[PDB]
Amino acid sequence: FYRLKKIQEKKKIIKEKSE
Amino acid sequence: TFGYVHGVSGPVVTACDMAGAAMYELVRVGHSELVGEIIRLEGDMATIQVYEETSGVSVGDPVLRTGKPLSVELGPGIMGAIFDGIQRPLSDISSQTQSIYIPRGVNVSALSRDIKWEFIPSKNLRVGSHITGGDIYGIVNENSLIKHKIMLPPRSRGSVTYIAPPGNYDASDVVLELEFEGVKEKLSMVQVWPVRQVRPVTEKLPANHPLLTGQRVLDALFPCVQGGTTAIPGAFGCGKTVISQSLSKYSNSDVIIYVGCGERGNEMSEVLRDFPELTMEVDGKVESIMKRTALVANTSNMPVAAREASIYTGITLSEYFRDMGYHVSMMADSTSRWAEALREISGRLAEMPADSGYPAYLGARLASFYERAGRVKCLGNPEREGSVSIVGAVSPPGGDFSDPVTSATLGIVQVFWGLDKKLAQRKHFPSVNWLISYSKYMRALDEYYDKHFTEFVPLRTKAKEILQEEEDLAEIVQLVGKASLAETDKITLEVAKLIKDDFLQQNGYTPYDRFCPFYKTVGMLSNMISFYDMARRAVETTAQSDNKITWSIIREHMGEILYKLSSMKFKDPVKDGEAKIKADYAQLLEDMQNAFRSLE
Amino acid sequence: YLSQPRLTYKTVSGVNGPLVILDHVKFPRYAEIVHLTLPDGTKRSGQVLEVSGSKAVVQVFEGTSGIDAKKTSCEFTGDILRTPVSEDMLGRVFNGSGKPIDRGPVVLAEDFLDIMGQPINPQCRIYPEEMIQTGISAIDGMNSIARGQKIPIFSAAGLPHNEIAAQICRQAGLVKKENFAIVFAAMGVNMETARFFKSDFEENGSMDNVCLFLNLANDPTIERIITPRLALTTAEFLAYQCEKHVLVILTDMSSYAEALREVSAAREEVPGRRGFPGYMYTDLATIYERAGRVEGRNGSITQIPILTMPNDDITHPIPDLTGYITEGQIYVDRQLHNRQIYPPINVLPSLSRLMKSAIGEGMTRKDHADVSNQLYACYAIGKDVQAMKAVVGEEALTSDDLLYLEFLQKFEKNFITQGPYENRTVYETLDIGWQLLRIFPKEMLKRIPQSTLSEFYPR
Amino acid sequence: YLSQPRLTYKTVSGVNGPLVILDHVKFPRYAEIVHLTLPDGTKRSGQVLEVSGSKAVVQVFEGTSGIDAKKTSCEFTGDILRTPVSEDMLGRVFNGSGKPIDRGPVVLAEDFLDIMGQPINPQCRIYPEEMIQTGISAIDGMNSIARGQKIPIFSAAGLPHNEIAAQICRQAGLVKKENFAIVFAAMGVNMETARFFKSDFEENGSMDNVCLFLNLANDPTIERIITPRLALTTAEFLAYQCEKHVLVILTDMSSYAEALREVSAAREEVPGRRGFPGYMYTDLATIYERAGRVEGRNGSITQIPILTMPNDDITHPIPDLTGYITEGQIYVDRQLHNRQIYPPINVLPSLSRLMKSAIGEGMTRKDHADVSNQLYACYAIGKDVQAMKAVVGEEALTSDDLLYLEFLQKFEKNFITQGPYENRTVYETLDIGWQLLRIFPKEMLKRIPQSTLSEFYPR
Amino acid sequence: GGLTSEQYHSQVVGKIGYIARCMQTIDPENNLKKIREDYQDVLIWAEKNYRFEEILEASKSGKCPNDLDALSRRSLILQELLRLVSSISPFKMKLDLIESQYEKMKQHVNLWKSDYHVKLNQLNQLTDYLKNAAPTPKNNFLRAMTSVLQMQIAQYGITEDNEGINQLFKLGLHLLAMANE
Amino acid sequence: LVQTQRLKIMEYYEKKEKQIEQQKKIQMSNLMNQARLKVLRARDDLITDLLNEAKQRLSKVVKDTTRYQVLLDGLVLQGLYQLLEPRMIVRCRKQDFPLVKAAVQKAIPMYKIATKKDVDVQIDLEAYLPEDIAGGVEIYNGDRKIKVSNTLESRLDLIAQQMMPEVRGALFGANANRKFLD
Amino acid sequence: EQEFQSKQQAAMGSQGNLSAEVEQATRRQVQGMQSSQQRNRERVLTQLLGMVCDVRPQVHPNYRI
């Protein structure tokens, strides 16, 4: 769960970076 | 020149304007100049694991860029000193500040520059003599125990242009000037070495000599060697710190570096209180063991990021004294705390974790740290031989040895002194679990045992056989009881109980069992194994006869002898001489023989 | 002193869980304290957990419920959290945040001390060696405490850890045959526990020398993260500046650990075992390691954290890390309590790391160590004999097993069992230990050297 | 050949663990090789892990310590990693990156071969049916190896897997009814292990036919990502081009998997089990599946990886995914090692999937398959009987159960147990197997056809 | 020898220089002709004055002996010989016996395992203690015994199993270890 | 007495004989390893002598201005094509500055024609290349964070390391044991 | 003892003989290598220098206007 939550947070940050 | 603090998430700071800052470079963050090390570098911003508490650090604070890696000053003045994680002399801090705390950002020198050391140059060296890294170009009479050899820094070489005459020189005075390719290098007694770079050696010779601890179970069943790597996993209260301190007090290592990486501070205070009183005899003169012990203390509540530095500093100091020809022993008080510090810094960096949150590079870090231990043929011109025996205690959370730190450690360390919580609760100290523990140096040490203690290897083998047989019989008895046990099985059980209670366990806080010389460690085992042999012989050879000798007959007839075997441990190596102890053990053997003959 | 006017920000960018987030902060300071005036005038407090550029993540102590984005006004104190400390704090009751709840005035500070304190220079730290006579046989006899020791009480929900701690308070004194100031912090303790401790300190004439920090069950959860530190800070002031001997009692460190877990989960920090933060060891060490004596100062701080083991699991992260940090533990046992043995202290899983030096010749008596070790060995063997008897029955026990069972019975009846107000001296405890050990013949006492047995056994 | 000048970028945009992310790269090439000149002149090498427009996430083999932005010069070689290969690579010692560490010259390339290897058409891959007489009865007797097979050695920390590997290396040979050239890839082996293997090869006179790749524990941990491929590439060159019967030893696939996990976590990829990359199966397969024979060629590549199972867990992702690829596994047991047996090969969980076609009449002997099957059956039944005995006691065991226990004892004492320098021909191993099977009556050997019982049992 | 090439060749140059210095110290008179010829390939770079850089270039190019294992073995042989001579300094050894000791040391497979090394370590314990020891009765007795031992070793040499030398070693070491009170 | 003493003496003698045999085997292995490495090092030294001769030949060729001008034009244009930047700088040897100027003059129009991209190329008259270098140029982009080193010292190395298989096959003959080249 | 001394003498003599033999073999191999390289020095050098001098400037294939 911690790894998946961390991956989700990183994906959100990357999406913001692309936007 | 200056970066600027940008953010602070705990021990991890971020800093803008650090375009050319190298990875693992050392910077000073904040106005108090808290030391820190760059660990990642994105764009023109760096991120710094600060070795001091970052509370009160504000965005925009200067971050000075010192174009050097985390390094230690190596030279006279280390022995007998207690440093912190980043090698600041805590005694000098206390004297300078006159306060019971460690000020944040205090910048006192690692080695005092005021003391005048007695320096005698190497006689052969002259102007125009080719000298290279690791060459001993002088000896500094640091104290009665340690002749601090003064060696060229590794990666330094050239022709000598000036070698100082013998006399009193301080750590800042130039002692040796040399030149290479025209460029001239001046050298005082102190050399700065990056802590994360392994100090080179000509060769890493195989480990071939025991690291005689004071403990019977460690010396006999699970030997360690000078230059080996050891681990001591165990729950809280099992006794790994006490094993480390007993090895620090009574062992054949010319130097001992205690690293206290992330453990109690009262333990470091206890070390400082005890060691000055403890003494060892050199040339018939008693000299304190603190004259050869160096402490690198970073207690549990001191900055987390410093713990890693502590370990590294520790090993570097050990390596420095290995290159002189001394058999250093580095006690890593708890590598679990170092792993936890790595995990915290990783969490602040939002790195992807490995098992149980630890970083993906924990195993690599532990392996690289343990690989610095082997016995070596030191660098430099004078042929020498040093060692760094790394004894690294592990603290598995919940006493579970599946811990990632413990599992990674057992894949590196060659000796495994696993401690049992149940044995500790029974006060069966040292709590070493004789079943799971192992030492991969026994085959490399039989060469030495057969020539110094020729009678010991078979005794060790028989003792381990007895313990394994007792384990099997106990597994059976727990469910079936002792009613159906064969008589020889009863003898195995009872001699195994004798070995456990009266040979393996050793009260380390008594005048007689604090240190158990190897002549004792082998004499006691010889007597117990002889009793086992005689009891088994009697029982087996009288099984067919009508006068069946059993365990009960032996116990009733040999109560006094059994009590003497149990009390063999109480012999005092110092109050009672070695000759007296050996004679008393021989007399007990004679009593055993006579009693068995009178019984059969 | 800070003379510049402090900035008040209405620029609350976002809120999430217990973390307010402020933007356009001018040079935020990490760990800085912030005062939040909510829309309805409710004044809360928070601590800057992180700074980044012009952003500051403020951890509100009272919780973020009711926080507005456009109307909440956060004024930055310009300094880290600092407790106002004075010797008058002895004999006062404060809430978990240090604000008085006894209808007295605020603390007229003698000094403003950093709540987090500082680690004591190990070279200047003195090793505790003055034994405290808690009066409890199970503690003095086999887990003796030293003045300046971190020795928590491991217990479970419903067990008499409060009673044992109160007894230690009311009959703790040096073995010199002076009062102990007490600093009592409570985290998430029901009203009954707080009333019990307060009424026990009042019944005895000690309330003059007791300072209480109370954070009951209904009080803010995050505030429990500062309730210990405040208390310890006070103790430090009373110990290392006023030269008092301060017994610090932190009640329900399980509640403090769970509050820390809540904050870490809000911050999504790397978890350790069972969801607790990966740094819970470091934080519990920051709490516990504020104990012991110090060179050149005649004061001391003795810590006795009381922590509830979840599900009576001594391997749970809270008790496990506490044992890793502290210098021992007093293990309150449910099996003994259900049998109505008080104090239900199971000496076998208990430990005192400074007992080895607080006992011997000089301090207490010279048979203390041997008697304690032999009692431990015989008790463990008696428990083993009980376990084997559960399987093989009475008739299969040898005479030695019967000796060990008799020792176990008389040990749990005469040594462990003790009146709630009975103050046994260390010598009485050792005499009881010897009268129990005399069950066995000398030859069965293999821990005690013959020199000690010959002198002490016959009597 | 590539004649165009290489492009050197001082444009490093970030450093993160082993990764160096560059920007403004002209047409990045995936898997391209980069040469990083550090500010102080230290030259390192890396491989482009991914490309995105003008970016390139290089992965440095020697580690990123000392690298800085604005000064590190990354020169892009314009090609994938093509290692030099020559026949004179036999009798050489190279580090994990292929550079000499025996004080010899750099490899004078006979050819430049891609380390990733050239996939082999399954239509023209010969099925290996030639048995390897390793001389270890626990492998020859029951888990026989066929020349061209992939069969790891599953073990744990402290077990003698290195000794077993050395024994196989110095005793490997065909069954008598062409000597092996050894290629060694050490990944994370301490100095003791590398010195042991090197001394074993020198002492046994095989060093002229041994090529060592050493990546010790102190060496960089991203280098061991290429250390096996390099080794295998050389093996392929020696096997499919020089016509040499190669034997490839890979010391610690656990350390290689840890390096993979390190790179994956640095890349922040979606993790697999235990944090290992989701693609560990494919990365491990690209290494294991390079064994075997091919049509037209005369050489072969026998592959014997060695794994250190964490916590002795054969379900751990590394051993699990290694079992899915390699054809069997040799399983070193901790219990047998503790009981001082050598080799500590537990024949119950270990198997060789190409044993059935390698044994039998003409290859070794008629009774090989039946003898092995019956030994395995008797061993399993004996283990079950031992488990039952541990609970109910020996007095409740029937005569046949005692026979099974006797077989188990004599099987671990005579068949599995073996001197480190003793190579038992397959026929001696089968004779020992028959001597152990003769403990039981013919009526209890259910898995041996009567046609063979009548021929081999009565002797 | 996992040393970097630069470090390895600097160490080679240092070993050559150390062999030259050891030869000069043991036999400044060049009387030990046999040993000097045995070490000609390494002593040529010191008899003919070369700069450190020239010798380093020669070592890199292969002209100098650039095998650290062989150089270390030879340097250890000469170091042990010089240690024997210095610990025997007042009682000069005969050239023939010096050559015999050198030949025995050369023959030995591993000198750090040699009984010669252990005997020299014992003699050095005695001599190092006596270097600074004040004239107390123990120190005078140890000085006398050490002088007699040095004379005997000069007459015979440490390669032999001379019972007299062994017994003198035992008694002198026991006196040294015995308490000063 | 004879039996036991004899047994011990044979044990001692046989163990010493086994040690001597092991030492002989180790000495043999070390001797053969040293011989192999010495031959390999001789081969490497011969190849390095060949490379040094090639360096000398290039240093001779650069002096022939008629040939060096064409070579320099090729090198400069190749660097420009490798970079494909809007603004580039050319580092050249100080004495080669006229030739590099002519090369850039020739290359700019051809570069524009071939890449359809306008370009500004400036010869770095401040920081020239070391004068010991055999020749060639070095083309940097506008900010100098990207460079292409078209020096002869670099081009010779680039080609020779790729050609090493052919040099090995030619100078020291091919390999008989290599049956398959695929 | 005497048998051991004879064995040691034989081992020393054989070691010296074979060390001389391998030194001679190494010298022969090096001389053969030199003789083989002298024949193809000029051809390989000419090919290498011709490849160096033939620049052939070219754009990356992926470049698109």
Ligand SMILES: Nc1ncnc2c1ncn2[C@@H]1O[C@H](COP(=O)(O)OP(=O)(O)O)[C@@H](O)[C@H]1O
């Ligand atoms: N050799 C020993 N002799 C006597 N007591 C010991 C010994 N080893 C450990 N102990 C006991 O174990 C307790 C725990 O010691 P320590 O090792 O400091 O704990 P930890 O396991 O946390 O390091 C101590 O209080 C000490 O009394």
